[PDB]
Amino acid sequence: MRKPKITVIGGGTGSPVILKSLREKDVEIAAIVTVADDGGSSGELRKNMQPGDLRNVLVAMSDMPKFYEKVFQYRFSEFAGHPLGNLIIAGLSEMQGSTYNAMQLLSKFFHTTGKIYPSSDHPLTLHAVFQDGTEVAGESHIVDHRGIIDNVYVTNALNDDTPLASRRVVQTILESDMIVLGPGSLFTSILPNIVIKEIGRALLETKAEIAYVCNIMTQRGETEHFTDSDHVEVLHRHLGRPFIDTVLVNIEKVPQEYMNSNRFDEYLVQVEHDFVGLCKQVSRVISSNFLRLENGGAFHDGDLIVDELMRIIQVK
Amino acid sequence: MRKPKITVIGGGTGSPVILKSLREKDVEIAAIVTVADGDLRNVLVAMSDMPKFYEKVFQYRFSEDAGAFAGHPLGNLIIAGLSEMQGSTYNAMQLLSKFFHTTGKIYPSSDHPLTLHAVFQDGTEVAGESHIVDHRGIIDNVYVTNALNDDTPLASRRVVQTILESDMIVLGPGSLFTSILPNIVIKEIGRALLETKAEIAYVCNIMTQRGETEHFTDSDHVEVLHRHLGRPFIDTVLVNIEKVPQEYMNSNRFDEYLVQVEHDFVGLCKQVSRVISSNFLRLENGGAFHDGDLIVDELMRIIQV
Ligand SMILES: [Cl-]
């Protein structure tokens, strides 16, 4: 029998430990990331503009992840106090004119294993609509805009045509045994991928099991009572129909004392749990301890997550 | 048969050309470089899994629009950041190699970081490489000390064994006083060169350098190497006899005081058993450079396992 095939979509915060654990298993891995608001197509002056989804996936799928985490994370103190490795992605992107144009150089540089694909082969802009109706374009701008995000959408930077998937992307989704959405920020990591029509169709049609790994914590632009159920609801609304087959949610408590002592943003809280609402929406709901309290934060435990995923995975 | 084992000692602009050609041949390569308080950088890129890639990446500089970072090269950022992480460039050598996915072996010459010292013909002493090249005068001799203590510099782990087990040692090309000699004035390395059964080959410079007289002939380069190691030790010497045209030099903005090395066959023959005088000149990127393939073709033709 062939190795199972697993495609991770989003690649936000928490995906590197999932990707590490997946690599220890006997499985092929593909990652899909959005690379938007990019280069000459961003509509910004060159001085004005100068993200982690790509960096996280690149380092996690590199030939020496431990090595490259150490390296892509050290900070000068000496310039003066900036992270090395953020400077490498900055450099190659400036060199090539956009991060999109740098992506093949970047996979060469990190000696990546498996496939990393952009969601589209054309330049994309990310748009957020806030609760009051205000529309903001650009991830860095969205993230800086005060308020609660209602919805996101993507457009082509260079024209009014409907954005299109990069097609090796469609085939990858359709030929997978499992799709892992997340973990990552819902609005700025996961959703930009699924709002491209050809990707939303592939998710709907794939024989793969679709698994969503929910956040440990609420994010900027999310309310205190934005439940795990609510996260599933937003995903389903953005794609246009229900489509998650399995949802994994953490129910182990993040102690207040740990959040206080570790100087967490005081408005980020543990994602509230709504079992009834999850069950109404998703066939298989997995609530368990998937929490790792280490390195000053409340992160996903990659192995506890991936052990569940390997238990349910089936070759299609 | 076995693959021949070739150790390359020194290098300027220089070694990368020789290392590139050697990599095309079926040979095991070791490189020995001097680490002070450059040549390391060029050997790292030359021995990497993607030299053209790393060369481009290395030398891109942030643009005028990169605010605070504007103008700084990417590769120097990398080498300086790993250096700082490890406490020194010397400390960072293993990580440097791992990153460039280097083939073969790269060794620092010495067991600690060094300071180069030069004694000038008028008796003046200057410490530090940059200070030496900037001092007005003619260099008589160089020696090395450890930067952090007064102990005799020793060879790093494996360097003596590597020299002794080699089929051939290639010295140069590169600045004699600041690239080649600092490696061989480490006493353990000098002794390893005197004792090794490896064929010792010296590739002479195309052009004279700072610290050297206009009439510093190929033969005088050999005399200086021999004098620093204390005995004759070079088995083969490869010298270029093709003329670097003056119009070429003028067009490409060459320094006027520096001339092409003068050929002295009789003097060479008095000192070294095998003297190879031929066209090893490549006039290419606004420079007078060594042709790596022609030099390496000659060396391969001489080599025995
Ligand atoms: Cl989280």
How far apart are the C-alpha atoms of A230 and A134, rounded to whole Å?
Answer: 22
Dihedrals phi, psi of B16, to nearest 5 degrees: -55, -40
Q: Enter the DSSP assignment of B177.
A: I
Residue type, A256: Q
Specified resolution (Å)? 2.0
The one-character DSSP state at B68 is G
Using CA coordinates, name the residue in chain A closest to B51: A109
CATH of A2-315, one of 3.90.180.10, 3.40.50.10680, 3.30.450.20, 3.40.50.300: 3.40.50.10680
Query: Does A87 contact B74 at a Cβ distance shorter than 8 Å?
Result: yes
B134 sits in which H/E element: helix B129-134
How many Å apart are CA B30 and CA B46, to the nearest integer?
12
Distance A215 CA to ligand 1 centre (A): 4
CB distance B169 to B7 below 8 Å: yes
- Preceding omega of B73 cis (within 30 degrees of 0): no
Separation of CA A14 and ligand 1 centre (Å): 7
Strand pairing of B199-203 and B236-240? parallel
What is the Cα–Cα distance from B285 to B252, expressed in whole angstroms? Answer: 9
For A76, the token pair is 């000068």
Nearest to A94 among B62, B81, B85 (CB): B62
Q: Residue A184 Cα, ligand 1 centroid: separation in angstroms?
A: 7
Task: Find all residues with CB under 8 Å of A278, minimum gap 6, and list them.
Answer: A228, A229, A232, A247, A249, A285, A287
CA nearest to B104, candidates B177, B28, B27 = B28
Residue type, B196: T
Whole-number Å distance between alpha carbons of B45 and B22: 14
Tell me the count of A-B CB pairs closer than 8 A. 58
Phi and psi at residue B125, to the nearest 5°: -105, 130
Q: Can you read off the two tokens belonging to residue B285?
A: 């990127």
Q: Gaps in chain B (C–N > 2.5 Å) come after which residues?
A: 37
The full 3-state SS of A210-250, as one line of letters, equals EEEECCCECCCCCCCCCCHHHHHHHHHHHHCCCCCCEEEEE
- Of the candidates B22, B6, B8, the residue with the CA atom closest to the CA atom of residue B293: B22
Is-contact B105 B162, C-beta < 8 A?
yes
Residue A49 Cα, gap to closest chain B Cα (Å): 9
Q: Which two tokens stand for residue B18?
A: 């020789």
Q: Do B62 and A111 touch (CB under 8 A)?
A: no
Residue of chain B whose alpha carbon sits nearest to that of A88: B74
* Alpha carbon distance A167, A189 (integer Å): 20
Return the H-helix or E-strand segment holding A16: helix A15-24
Looking at the complex, report in whole angstroms how far the Cα of residue B37 sits from the nearest Cα belonging to chain A. 17
Q: Which residues of A touch B69 (CB under 8 A)?
A: 79, 82, 87, 90
CA B75: distance to chain centroid? Answer: 20
Whether A305 contacts A18, CB under 8 Å: yes
Kindly report the CATH number that applies to the domain delimited by B2-305. 3.40.50.10680
From the list B50, B65, B84, which residue is nearest A76 (CB)?
Answer: B84
Dist. CA A88–CA A91, nearest whole Å: 5
Tracing tokens 């992160």 back to the chain, one arrives at A299
Query: Closest-CA residue in chain B for A84?
Result: B81
Residues preceding discontinuities in chain A at C–N > 2.5 Å? 50, 78
Question: Residue A300: which residues within 8 A CB-CB, separation 6 or more?
Answer: A14, A17, A18, A183, A213, A216, A250, A290, A291, A292
Is B66–A74 a contact, with Cβ atoms under 8 angstroms apart?
no
For chain B, the first-to-last Cα distance in angstroms comes to 8
For β-strands B236-240 and B274-278, DSSP reports them as: parallel
| Amino acid in the structure at residue B46 | A
Give the start-to-end residue ranges of the domains of chain A.
Answer: 2-315
Q: Find all residues with CB under 8 Å of A248, minimum gap 6, and list them.
A: A211, A212, A213, A214, A286, A288, A290, A305, A308, A309
Length of chain B: 305
Residues of A in contact with B81 (CB under 8 A): 71, 74, 76, 84, 87
**DSSP assignment letter at A162:** P
The dihedral of CA B158, B160, B161, B164: what is its sign? positive
